[PDB]
Design a protein around this ligand. Structure first.
Ligand code: NAG
Ligand code: NAG
Ligand code: NAG
Ligand code: NAG
Ligand code: NAG
Ligand code: NAG
Ligand code: NAG
Lengths: 208, 50, 49
């Protein structure tokens, strides 16, 4: 099953303030208007990196698992939420065939859209907005977490609500910051000839 | 300036690093380059005065 | 005339260094100041990380 990504899958590629400026970059971003595989249990490739977004009312999705095989054979990254704390660790877990040792890292802390970018060592970016099938709109995902762990990830899983996944590709983007350091619009510079023009001119408005 | 809570460095137009966020009390500091410029000497002719 | 003949430049006074309020230190009191120490047939081996 599938859905259109529209303008989503964008984040700040560095911890740098910029204002009223059309900064161009090449990085792992979600291609605009690409299919996004859709879910509502299964196992997926991590690719070069993942965009993940979930629309919820009853808080069904609690976390993720990442690695090569995700069942005993090596240290596999885990994130899991239970009650009022979020628990994150990398141990060699004998994980179940269908869920719902040796730690180098352990940590303890529809009406909602929750969005996440996972990428290579490892970074987590997110956003949330209230909602009222992934919505037509734009915002950039702010960085939440840096994990210095160096774990060799190639595959991943959800822990359990409609939710969607797409895979980042190394494309050129033009990112429009406002007066307040916030990315408020973007161009995927290889989408269509007009986007190739906005990135040629470094401009969001194109004259005749 | 009002940077977002994760932002560390500021940038202006030609990648001129324009500000930083102090990691010991959370102030954004505007950076001015240390003052420099040409020096000109204004002279009547030495045939007139030194 | 007016002749341009040098460039002015204010030099630095001294050098500042800035980094976070130093925190998340490793508890060396679990290796150098602990209440017990191990044998010489099997030692305490700890991954500091
Ligand atoms: C309705 C829709 O967008 N369908 C597209 C299909 O045309 C395309 O061939 C496929 C690529 O995997 O992604 C999906
Ligand atoms: C359950 C698990 O994967 N344990 C591993 C072990 O197999 C490996 O021999 C050792 C190497 O130091 O690291 C740990
Ligand atoms: C609020 C709550 O239930 N927190 C528990 C925590 O006490 C426990 O140590 C952890 C184990 O992974 O799971 C979670
Ligand atoms: C240096 C290293 O460990 N590389 C491995 C590679 O051999 C393996 O095929 C791949 C599986 O996705 O994970 C990575
Ligand atoms: C206006 C004026 O001061 N002119 C004098 C000129 O009479 C003199 O012969 C010369 C000597 O080098 O210096 C100059
Ligand atoms: C900038 O920040 C203020 C709050 O200080 C906010 O009210 C304003 O709407 C923001 N401007 C933009 C363009 O988002
Ligand atoms: C650093 O320590 C000072 C007290 O010396 C404290 O007032 C300040 O808020 C701290 N800043 C950070 C970012 O930890």
């Amino acid at each position: 099953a599938y859905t259109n990504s529209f303008t989503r899958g964008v984040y700040y590629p560095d911890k740098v303030f910029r204002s009223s400026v059309l900064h161009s970059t090449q990085d792992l971003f979600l291609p605009f208007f690409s299919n996004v595989t859709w879910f509502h249990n299964p196992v997926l490739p991590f690719n070069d990196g993942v965009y993940f977004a979930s629309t919820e009312k009853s808080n069904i999705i609690r976390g993720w698992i990442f690695g090569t095989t995700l069942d005993s054979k090596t240290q596999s990254l885990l994130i899991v939420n239970n009650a009022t704390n979020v628990v994150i660790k990398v141990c060699e877990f004998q994980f179940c065939n269908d869920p719902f040792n040796n730690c180098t890292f352990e940590y303890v802390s529809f009406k909602n859209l929750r969005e996440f970018v996972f990428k290579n060592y490892f970074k987590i970016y997110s956003k949330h907005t209230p909602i009222n099938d992934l919505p037509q709109g734009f915002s950039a995902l702010e960085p939440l977490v840096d994990l210095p762990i160096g774990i060799n990830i190639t595959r991943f899983q959800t822990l359990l609500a409609a939710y969607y996944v797409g895979y980042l590709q190394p494309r050129t983007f033009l990112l429009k910051y406002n007066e307040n350091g916030t990315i408020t619009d973007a161009v995927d510079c290889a989408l269509d000839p007009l986007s190739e023009t906005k990135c040629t001119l470094k401009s969001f408005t194109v004259e005749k | 300036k009002k940077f977002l809570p994760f932002q560390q460095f500021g940038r202006d137009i030609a990648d001129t690093t324009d500000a930083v966020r102090d990691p010991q009390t959370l102030e954004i500091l505007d950076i001015t380059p240390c003052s420099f410029g040409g020096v000109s000497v204004i002279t009547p002719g030495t045939n007139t005065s030194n | 005339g007016i002749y341009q003949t040098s460039n002015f430049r204010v030099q630095p006074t001294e050098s500042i260094v800035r980094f976070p309020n130093i925190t998340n230190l490793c508890p060396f009191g679990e290796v150098f100041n602990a209440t017990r120490f191990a044998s010489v047939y099997a030692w305490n081996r700890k991954r500091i990380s």
